[PDB]
Amino acid sequence: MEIKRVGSQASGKGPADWFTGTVRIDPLFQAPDPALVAGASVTFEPGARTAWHTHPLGQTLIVTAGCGWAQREGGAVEEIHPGDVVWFSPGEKHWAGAAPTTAMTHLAIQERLDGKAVDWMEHVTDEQYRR
């Protein structure tokens, strides 16, 4: 039994290649082999969002604070709220982030395929970031 106490994992800033705007990543877990799952808490400041991206074994988001936006390619921009659970399919191109006026925090849970949790693609333009 390994316990990582609250406060023991340092926060980090969202890399510019992965996010538009100011994002904070709070690591939560990375399961050891042979388990595949990993998780992090991601807080988007107002107006911030991921680039477009895919996950090789899909991704589950559990919104935990605030009010955010998310979209898959070809779909509508949806508003997501604390307690909502979002599922993105393997290889489904999508983004998520804060709404323009409110921050959002979600717990992002995904299984790694050969250690790889994500494939990063182009940023979400100001023209795409609207609803």
Ligand X SMILES: C[N+](C)(C)CCCC(=O)O
Nearer to Mn ion, 94 or 103 (CB): 94
Q: How far is the CB of 115 from Br ion (least distance, A)?
A: 27
Nearer to Br ion, 116 or 131 (CB): 131
From the list 91, 17, 11, 87, the residue with the least C-alpha distance to 50 is: 17
CB atoms within 10 A of CB 79: 13
What 8-state DSSP symbol labels residue 129?
Answer: S
Q: Per rule CB under 8 A, is residue 114 in the interface with a second copy?
A: no
Q: How far is the CB of 108 from ligand X (least distance, A)?
A: 4
Q: Per rule CB under 6 A, is residue 99 in the interface with ligand X?
A: no
Q: How far is the CB of 6 from Br ion (least distance, A)?
A: 8
* Residues contacting Br ion: total by CB under 5 A: 7
- Report yes or no: 50 and 104 within 8 Å, Cβ to Cβ: no
Nearer to ligand X, 119 or 125 (CB): 119
From the list 60, 76, 53, 78, the residue with the least C-alpha distance to 68 is: 78
80: Cβ contacts below 8 Å, ≥ 6 apart: 61, 63, 67, 68, 69, 70, 86, 96, 104, 106
Q: Per rule CB under 6 A, is residue 80 in the interface with ligand X?
A: no
- Which residues are at the interface with Br ion (CB under 5 A)? 5, 8, 47, 100, 125-127
